[PDB]
């Protein structure tokens, strides 16, 4: 009988999509397809380490249910992950977050019983993660994920991701285009696919505004899930063999076209990583070689983020 | 390889879960698993009737993307999942809704590059199928998809919706649990699996307040995505054995435990059904019985309309 024995179990396993139109229209020579993260239980890739970086803690025997609280800093989608894994196996958890953060991402969080503790605007991340240190040190058998460092992050992608990649293109995939987040994605694909075809090209995505791997300065930007600001400890850096930046407004109106002209309603990160893609298929040097894009999420939670952003936005003008 | 054409060869083919807590805690007999529907690529059971009313039209030559304008009076799950396969077939496609709806499933629908065309409030939804049949008539080739009687809809069911249930179930499978919306999804399970396992039953589940399948008055309710007030061409009334009725704060309720006792985010109609289930699933002489519960969404979606109104 095919019945999970809970949600966790149903994580990954995504499928790959062709594009239709946009790539043609770009006169794309690279042949360009669409792993969809978005089709996870809870909508996004960190489904994928929600899940796994609990499961290799409680494997470890460093976890349980009846005893552990979770610990995390978290203003994207782990922090959803997570709270959706927590009430699934039974775990208290307390996320902690800057005061600016969506308010519709705080209601998802709170509807899966997670325990919420704001932090000043402006200190940022910086703030929630000192706030997260101290509750960690607060509760005795407590236990933080620390999704940037955590080994099992770029492992559940090595074991999962990379080998859907692998089975569903047959060997085939000449190149992978990911944005980095905490980088866990694009390492674990790396990782294998580089090990099994030495021709297989990395090829990592991050903001202009914020063009830290390329080797700039860290700064403001709008693509929610990618470029943190810093080099995670978790990204294979010897494994990248090339960073393409992307503009805000290059990265939403890829968005816009992947909804509109391919039916994929897509956050901002997917926009970037198609919008690189792009890019890369143009070049003469890979006509017919075979491109997988990540789409990290379904686009849903992010529009309603630009419809609360913008109600934020005319109340506070003037 | 393994690649889909386009998101519309990705829908249904959605998993099975038990619950860990709920039935246990309620001290049921009988054995509870979801079917989630909120697995689906846009997160509703609609989806299944979005792509295949398209594509039974197309197969009987009545529609082409290159000249068919696509028409639906349609304010919810129906609109995005039809919005999703018109931009990823090529469709144009007008939706019609009273202006009273709300801007999350306006701009769910706008982000899919749906036209919308907005009725007076005063009008109801007689008000949208009335400007949808206008525009019908006023293009030439347009089509109505009309999800209330076209028969595609119960049959994706049969054909998909109800072989995963058989199959995943290995044809233990005693109950289907589900809430009544257009009612293709407990109609096409129903004509299939009833006709494999005579044993096997069939409980409807709609609003307190407008209990018309169970013979009474149609009245409002809070339960987003079942009980139109009416009993739908397309439900097969004659294959229902039970009508369960569930109030607006039981759906509500069980929707809160299912996710935070579960971890299943569900809307309001996922809640409904459990209610239901549960009943059903207390009752002595169902013990063991395997029944199948239907989550027709993910909850996202009705989170952020249910914010939207406590600002509205
Ligand atoms: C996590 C995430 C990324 C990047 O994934 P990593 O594995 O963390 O690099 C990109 N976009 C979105 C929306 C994400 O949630
Ligand atoms: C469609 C729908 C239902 C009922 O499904 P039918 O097949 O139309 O009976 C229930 N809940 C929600 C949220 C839906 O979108």
């Not at 499928?15 to 794309?28: D, W």
Request: glycine share 10%; aromatic share 4%.
């Amino acid at each position: 009988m095919r019945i999970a024995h809970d949600v966790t179990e149903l994580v990954g396993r995504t499928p790959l999509v062709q594009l239709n139109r946009i790539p043609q229209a770009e006169g794309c020579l690279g042949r360009i397809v669409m792993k969809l993260e978005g089709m996870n239980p809870a909508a996004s890739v960190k489904d994928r380490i929600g899940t796994h970086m609990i499961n290799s803690a409680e494997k470890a025997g460093l976890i349980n249910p009846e005893t552990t609280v979770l610990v995390e800093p978290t203003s994207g989608n782990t922090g959803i992950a997570l709270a959706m894994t927590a009430a699934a196996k039974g775990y208290r958890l307390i996320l902690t977050m800057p005061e600016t953060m969506s308010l519709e991402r705080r209601a998802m969080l709170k509807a899966y019983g997670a325990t919420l503790e704001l932090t000043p605007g402006s200190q940022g991340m910086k703030g929630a993660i000192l706030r997260a240190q101290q509750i960690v040190d607060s509760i005795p058998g407590a236990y933080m994920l620390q999704q940037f460092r955590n080994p099992s992050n770029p492992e559940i992608h090595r074991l999962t991701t990379a080998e859907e990649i692998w089975q569903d293109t047959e060997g085939q995939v000449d190149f992978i285009v990911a944005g980095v987040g905490t980088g866990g994605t694009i390492t674990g694909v790396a990782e294998v696919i580089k090990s099994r075809k030495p021709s297989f090209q990395v090829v990592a995505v991050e903001p202009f505004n914020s063009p830290v791997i390329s080797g700039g300065n860290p700064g403001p930007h709008k693509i929610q899930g990618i470029g943190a600001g810093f080099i995670p400890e978790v990204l294979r850096t010897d494994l990248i063999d090339e960073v393409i930046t992307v503009s805000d407004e290059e990265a939403f109106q890829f968005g816009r076209r992947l909804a509109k002209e391919e039916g994929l309603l897509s956050g901002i990160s997917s926009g970037a990583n198609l919008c690189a893609a792009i890019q890369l298929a143009q070049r003469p040097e890979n006509e017919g070689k075979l491109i997988v894009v990540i789409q990290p999420s379904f686009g849903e939670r992010y529009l309603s983020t630009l419809m609360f952003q913008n109600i934020e936005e005319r109340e506070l003008t003037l």
